[PDB]
Design a protein around this nucleic acid. Structure first.
Ligand SMILES: *Cc1c(COP(=O)(O)O)cnc(C)c1O
Ligand SMILES: *Cc1c(COP(=O)(O)O)cnc(C)c1O
Ligand SMILES: *Cc1c(COP(=O)(O)O)cnc(C)c1O
Ligand SMILES: *Cc1c(COP(=O)(O)O)cnc(C)c1O
Lengths: 474, 474, 447, 447
RNA sequence: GCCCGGAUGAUCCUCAGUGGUCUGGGGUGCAGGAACCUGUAGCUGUCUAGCGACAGAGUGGUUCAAUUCCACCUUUCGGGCGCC
């Protein structure tokens, strides 16, 4: 029954090794260098969860929001964190009914701030995780700016053909002013002259902010943030940066750091899933003025989900800063490999890799040898890649017209009205493996052969199943 | 190695019993009457998850959002659903990269619509789950209305002292017009005269909407929705109903149904955690015009978390419509029991249960025998209940001034400037057990004794630990 | 913050109370307390140490994360290679888990009706192999013994356990007393005198059994064993759930000799098949059985019952025992009603508190094969546990031929159907069984 | 929609290929395929049927949801009460699980070096009790046998397995050949002739062992057994991970007689302690051992290794075997370097492919108790698996007194330290061990 | 249990018929002018101090038009399958 050496022999001795990793986390708020063992991580989460009042043993609840859970499957999959984050008046305020969830939220934001520094923006002052994706999080930035600039109606926006970040300004109730890009070689870049010309035409007081973008599909490249930040500093206009998946790119993060160094960056927003390999649904709002970032936080009404914060807390504690650095290194290596592989394949089909050296993530291969008008070969290629279980291979044909929330885009998906050619997108994002590139190259090869010929074990099953899906669509 | 009767002997025979429960769900989109076994539920989720492209065996990904997951703990706790819900242009659109998640989202919304009908609003036309809490979801309603009424500046709002729903109109960029309530007996009720007078004073075209509330703390009661809906129909003003935790109240839901029957209700919003016992973070936007509800959905920019939808899908499939009906029945029974218990206890301390028959969820017990000015006894009671692990027991002292987003409230937390007395809140919400009431009554008894005396095993450990927490705060 | 750190104290009190007294909690633990306890135990094992390095052949390495998590990172099993009950220095948490589990199990055995039990231990083998371990222990104490005297019960595991241990079973036929089959005490004592006590390894009796057989006459057998100095081993496979079976074991130990009694973990505690409990009244003999086990053993059955008893509590287990009795009365009455409608009757077996039997005399197996059919149809309608017993079934088990197999005698008067009220049975179980049995008898009567 | 339904076909192909050939997949399954497979198997068991009602005593009821989920709802165990290998009609999914697991295990045994193996089965007992089951089976074939001839190895489980089965071990001392302790073939054959083949139950040899002992001379023993018609039982506890041990078993069966060889599941497949594999070359004899097991048994060890082999694949297991060899060379060289710095040496034991030994001659146990200290300090520094062997240690196991215990002989020349490269060992393990051993020897030398 | 095929649900009480905003026959009670003639009829939820009010007719679909036609569900009948 007993065999009891007081509490336990090693019950606190080797347990001390776990507590000291936890104590170092709470004291300095930094990512562990090497990842925690699963046992340490789950011991930490279990001890946090029992701090929440809904998990108290002697608790009784007479309110309308007591964190009750009907399904045990639901309660266990969330590690018994039910109360979310924040209070009804402040999403950043400690919740007296959920001290464990509040500590979870504070530690997660501290870990994320640490990662943003090592990723490239060392002068970041403040950040917080918000359980909305990047589009809605950009909207929250604009909603906050409205009260600071009540006469403003326009958001000046260098064009990028992505529906979420475009709609974010309309959802916030402002009028986007689409600044077309300038073609420099193969690259589409910021028209700094047109941006400043529009500021003078409309008047700075009528401008809510300038909305720039770093991460993007080639042949677009990250915006000229340093020059845009200087324009924003000179005319006293807020600068909001869409950095959706730029955390994984030291080049993108350094553009942000330099923009804040020489000019004005009020906030930059990044997706959680794209930069940390977690489910879709969360984002980080970061900036350099602590007071302003807290203003955006206080703009949020009501409590919020703790699930995205828990996901990234688990991820960073398991990976460590070394594990994340390793993922960033391999992403750079896989970009070179993917670039070289596309160079080799495009040569064999009389295509080429578009020359986009300023885009460190996305690549583009021309599709000039395909006739979309007659054979619809460009659209056929995208469908054949899809049925062959290639995902993320974005096909951009010429002359696509698209209306988004009443605004009509010419040459939609190409970020400009008349790009020289149609092309295919591919990218080296965090977590990509060599198998992804090799299978993509192999399957793109077969698709290019089949479309050019049509104008004139499990591998064959994926091919046989693709032929059935191809014929069903036809 | 084999012993193989083709595939299996019963491998499809008793499996058929599982498939037929699943086929009935997908065909009619209704809640099962009796809850599913856990085995059926998890088989369903596993088969949905393998439909998502990130879980394909022969998949390769070359994009920036491929649903990659670094941590196995994260992937398993979400049943391998990574891609979220929706597309970057439409949160309601099927995601070709996540056919399983898209089916999950559609079935969840169908189940939730079914529950809203059986809960009382049988004429509901459309609804969707949004992974934001009720405050942010109300903001999304106002953001959608802005484009339909671009000259509107004001939201007419019968006062309720809750920071989230108040801030939701300011976060959306509108000016709330606070309509004070009328005291009728002990109850605070809608001042229909002042609402119509403010409509005429400001002009209907300047009114974005009327923002009413059903579920609320006593002594406030649900707004007079039928009369407000008639005012809204006559002046052509949209009507938005805050039904945060009203789904659990057949009285609240019937007010909504009658309001739509005789007048105009454009949308009503309810919390997921408060009505379905799931983690905080999600809500339902429902209405009677299908086209308008889709407009709110399309206002959302970008993809969204699937975690709240998964939580309520698991919950409703496990509970069934019978299980949910049982929770609603027990909530009514526990309201009577809690009411009778407070009647008995308040008598022994020369207090009374406030007469609020029109509030079917929240109750209030007077605290007239406590002196807040001299002894601060009302604040002391709330703290003593907290240290004794009573949660949800809301103490409302007199004369509290509070500023929320620049607007100053007199008598804050009482929903009126000068309520006759201080009081204590308690409620019978879904999932409450008799132990909650008995422990609340027992601990409130000890607290009342201690505060009145101060002016003149685990039970004792909760008391001994409360005395230590009480002295530390002092 | 200060309330949350004081909230861990609430869990610590429950854990401390368990380590100090080793009794089941009265009310079951919350899952949060249980999993907290298990995680703290598992990190005491050396394979889960953060700075551990392993240069041996048994380091507790786990290749699959799915395997490690589902066992709460308990990898080293129980015991040492020289003693299954010894503390494993490389697995202090697993050793603590094994000691607590044995304590909780002893607590339940007393609660269930054998208050005078002295010792017991969980063994990760089922009841058959656990009876074998008992016989293997008795061999070294009685090296001239060759026979095991065994009142007949038609169950292959307990019968084979004697042959596996290397002894010759001596089958004692039962006596028909009314409808019941009971111990033939005269035939037992006659075989003791014929073969000689020194040649008898033990008397192997059985409590829990299928009707119309009833628990053996343990008191009279315990006196025979005491008079002749012959060990007594009781097969109590699923008798823990029956206060009548347990009190019968308690009485036999009071008036006579009972060396050990064995019970299945899955049949009495609703856990997966695989474990058993060896219990006795001589602490030293039970220890001798434990020390006869060679090498380490799986900790999975111990962990299953530990989780179950901590989640149920003694009140939760008491409730299941009370409901088993009420379900038995309900099942009995419903069989009386149904048997009346088909010109059958419920066999009068008041000495069996778990299993019942209903006559199948009106069904013709000789001409229509109707009795064999009924059990087949009962399966396809998904009635599990219903057991049809035809007449004159011959069956060979390890070379021994049984006549009238499944009936525990050579010529029982009639064929019959078995049904039982075991722990965890619901009113749905009986109502479904009655409905499907009615439909099954209608179709057989038509043809 | 059409691509997702075709996506289940990809998983179905892997599952279909497993059921059709019963071999390990070359590359490991994804967790999604594995858990899909397990869930489909579990719903085949009757306890998981949606319309099931239970009126029996063994219905597979589970009180705790934590217990049910952690076992993937496999509750009924393996086998029937009359045959552990028979298909359980109430648990078709569990029976299918057991058959697949035995097939995968047979595939690995061939892959590991015994290509001529005919049959094998997983038994949810550890290696000690599994050797006991072998001896218990041999008793009925050789009812006059009393002795088991056993080349000495100082391990309590395999030694006790002979006594548990009820036989007298005949300890054959080993021969010092250089630094190695090897089989004394002349003494073995002399005991066969002295005691008489008819009185010998079997010869019980051992492959995997601690240095400086080496695997037994299986070929010469297999010929002795064939000439005298004596069964041969091989203790291969952790020899599956060694192509040298497995090939030695293969060669012995080719030139002589080997009736069965037994191996631990945890030591060879990195799963929790609790299971073993009994394998042989006569399909009928292995079946006889299986049928000697009485009653049902736990399915937990089978499920653990099934998950592990499906997740690893044969390529994954091959990789672990290759890395064990490379880790052995690395550990050997690092011990050579460290022993040189302390005026010690690595004992030359080239016939042992798993375990190594380093001399501790410069440490004084008689005056300073330094040898006993080193093992103590090695533990507190969290070095597990390191094994110090002093001189002249006396130890009694089940009544038999060993002199020079832990050393496998009565007077080995010196004390020494044991270290091994077992499957799953990392370069961190060796580097940490060398560093901590260096610090441990520095402190002992100071005092 | 599953598969197949009839009917079944709350005005394939009752037996029938009917795509036409339902009809025929037998039967019961309540109400008046043995049985005859006439009228009449039940249930569930919600909101009410109550009168009463608001809905629902297994869930959906087709159609100008569903008691009627189609699919599925509930109940029930019949057939098939049966070493567990
Ligand atoms: C719960 C509730 C809300 C919503 O608050 P959130 O934290 O945003 O979910 C709004 N108003 C009232 C009256 C509420 O009870
Ligand atoms: C991912 C991304 C966004 C954000 O889209 P959400 O679905 O809201 O997360 C915005 N702009 C770009 C360029 C992106 O890549
Ligand atoms: C591991 C091993 C055994 C196995 O003993 P158990 O604890 O019963 O598994 C037996 N002999 C030797 C030499 C071993 O290494
Ligand atoms: C259950 C039971 C056994 C146990 O046999 P195992 O399958 O080994 O657990 C033995 N005898 C009887 C009468 C039983 O009911």
């Amino acid at each position: 029954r007993l065999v009891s050496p007081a509490y336990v022999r090693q019950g606190c001795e080797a347990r001390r090794s776990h507590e000291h990793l936890i104590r170092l986390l709470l004291e300095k708020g930094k990512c562990p260098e090497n990842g925690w063992d699963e046992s340490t991580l789950e011991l930490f989460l279990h001890e946090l969860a029992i701090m929440d009042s809904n998990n108290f043993l002697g608790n009784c609840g007479v309110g309308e929001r007591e964190g009750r859970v009907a399904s045990a499957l639901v309660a266990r999959r969330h590690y018994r964190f039910i109360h979310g984050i924040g209070r009804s008046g402040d999403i950043s305020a400690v919740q007296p009914k959920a001290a464990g969830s509040s500590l979870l939220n504070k530690i997660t934001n501290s870990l994320v701030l640490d990662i943003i520094k090592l990723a490239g923006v060392h002068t970041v002052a403040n950040c917080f995780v918000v359980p909305m994706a990047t589009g809605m999080s950009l909207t929250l930035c604009f909603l906050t700016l409205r009260h600071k600039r009540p006469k403003a109606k326009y958001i000046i926006w260098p064009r990028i053909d992505q529906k979420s970040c475009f709609k974010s300004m309309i959802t916030a109730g402002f009028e986007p002013v689409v600044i077309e890009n300038v073609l420099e070689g193969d690259e589409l870049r910021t028209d700094l002259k047109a941006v400043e010309a529009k500021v003078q035409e409309l008047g700075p007081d009528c401008i809510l902010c300038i909305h720039s973008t770093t991460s993007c599909f080639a042949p677009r490249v990250p915006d000229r943030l340093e020059e845009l930040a200087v324009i924003c500093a000179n005319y006293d206009i807020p600068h909001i940066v869409n950095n959706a998946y730029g955390v994984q790119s030291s080049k993108c993060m350094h553009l942000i750091q330099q923009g804040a160094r020489v000019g004005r960056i009020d906030a930059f927003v990044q997706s959680l899933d794209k930069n940390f390999m977690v489910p879709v649904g969360g984002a980080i709002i970061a900036g350099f003025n602590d007071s302003f970032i807290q203003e955006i936080s206080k703009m949020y009404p009501g409590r919020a989900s703790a699930s995205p914060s828990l996901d990234v807390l688990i991820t960073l504690l398991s990976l460590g800063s070394n594990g994340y650095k390793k993922l960033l290194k391999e992403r750079k290596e896989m970009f070179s490999y993917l670039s070289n592989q596309i160079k080799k394949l495009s040569e064999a089909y009389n295509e080429r890799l578009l020359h986009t050296p300023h885009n460190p993530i996305s690549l583009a291969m021309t599709l000039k040898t395909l006739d979309e008008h007659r054979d619809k070969a460009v659209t056929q290629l995208g469908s054949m890649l899809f049925t062959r279980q290639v995902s993320g291979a974005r096909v951009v044909p010429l002359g696509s017209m698209q209306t988004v929330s009443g605004y009509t885009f010419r040459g939609f998906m190409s970020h400009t009205n008349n790009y020289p050619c149609a092309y295919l997108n591919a990218a080296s994002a965090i977590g990509m493996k060599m198998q992804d590139v090799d299978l993509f190259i192999k399957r793109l090869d077969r698709c290019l052969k089949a479309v050019r010929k049509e104008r004139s074990t499990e591998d064959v099953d994926i091919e046989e199943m693709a032929l059935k899906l191809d014929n069903a669509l036809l």
